[PDB]
Amino acid sequence: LSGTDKSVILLMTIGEDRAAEVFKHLSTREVQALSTAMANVRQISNKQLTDVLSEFEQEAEQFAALNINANEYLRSVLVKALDILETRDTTSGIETLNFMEPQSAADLIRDEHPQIIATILVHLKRSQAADILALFDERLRHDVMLRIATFGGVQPAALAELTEVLNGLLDGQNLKRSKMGGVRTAAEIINLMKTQQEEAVITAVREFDGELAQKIIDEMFLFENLVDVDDRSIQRLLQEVDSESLLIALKGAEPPLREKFLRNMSQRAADILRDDLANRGPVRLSQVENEQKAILLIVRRLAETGEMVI
């Protein structure tokens, strides 16, 4: 069980009033995440209750409770004697503007004023700002660089307003949480089609836009590209591929790819595979395509685990 699940069980088992009181001490993101997780709860078993309660007790003893509300206590002490969460939120927004993809952030801030872009990048990590600037056009990127070189500081109010606007934009994006609609999704769809319709769609997209089809082609693994994969990954792949499946799949493979597979096998196994290829009769194209699809699925599984580099 994740910590979110344990927290959800704890909130469900303490009563509605207590859970509501706890929500008053949690941030908006945490409350939204817990409410979303509480929505999908269908059953809580005996272990999921007892272990969660014991872990909650051990955690309450871990930091020994205490920690009176910092904001109210600090305000009362300052008032009686005489930043804070706003500074923490600005720091979090600085963190939020570094974990995103460089392309997404660049597109988000592409239309902003060059001084605004420079101000944002100053507070960002060096690598993230470097990647974002690499995606801008020459003129805008160099203008932002020059403005950074002469950055004179920003008043806290303007920085806070910019942070609030960026937080609103991020909230809108997260509410959208745009489902993958780029060339990668189409390539995944295209890879699972039959060869006929796959090639027809690729050719038609190239007819409409050669660049778009090439982008989809670059994002798809339609077999016959294992020749460009390193020898170590191919050797790792051969340990998970059945000999008969490899034999059937390599029947329709090009001689370069066939030699690429043979070079990564043991010499005895390579000779056996060559003899089987020379002796086995014609194989229906559908079976070869199915075997190649299975090999591609194995390749994807290995790549997801980090054992294979594509």
Binding site: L10, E30, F56, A65
Partner: peptide, 27 residues
């Protein structure tokens, strides 16, 4: 369901919130 449920119900809501925050951070 021993007295631990009742004992946990009497804990400060801030303590529960901090435990929840730590659990979510550990994810």
């Amino acid at each position: 369901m021993s007295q631990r449920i009742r004992e946990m119900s009497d804990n400060d809501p801030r303590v529960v919130a901090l435990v929840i925050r730590q659990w979510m951070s550990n994810d």
